[PDB]
Amino acid sequence: IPREPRRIVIHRGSTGLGFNIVGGEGGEGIFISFILAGGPADLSGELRKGDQILSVNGVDLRNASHEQAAIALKNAGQTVTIIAQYKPEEYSRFEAK
């Protein structure tokens, strides 16, 4: 699985973007914690649980809190560009064992 940043385009559905995010306050990162099967984000493996969302459209989320990121993902439009980077090592600290 590539570890360099990846560009994914999502088309918002009648339920949102099809994934959940985990994070916290500013700086802990925004990570994909769940991807809905058949949802807008289920794109033949292009997005992965454990991806860090580096940005959404023009909005940098590397340093955003969870509350900021949630707001940005909802105001992102019907066509959404996600820059994702696989970092399961960093993500693992958010996921209960």
What does this structure look like?
The protein has helices spanning 66-74, 88-91, and strands spanning 6-11, 19-22, 31-35, 51-56, 59-60, 79-86. With 97 residues, it is α+β, with helices and mostly antiparallel strands. Strand 2 and strand 3 (31-35) form a beta hairpin. A four-stranded antiparallel β-sheet has the order 1-6-4-5, with no helix packed on it. The chain has one domain (1-97). It contains two helices and six strands, in the order E-E-E-E-E-H-E-H. The protein is 13% helix and 32% strand. The PDB classes it as signaling protein. The entry lists the keywords pdz domain, signaling protein. It forms a monomeric assembly. The entry is titled "Crystal Structure of the third PDZ domain of PSD-95 protein D332G mutant: space group I4122".
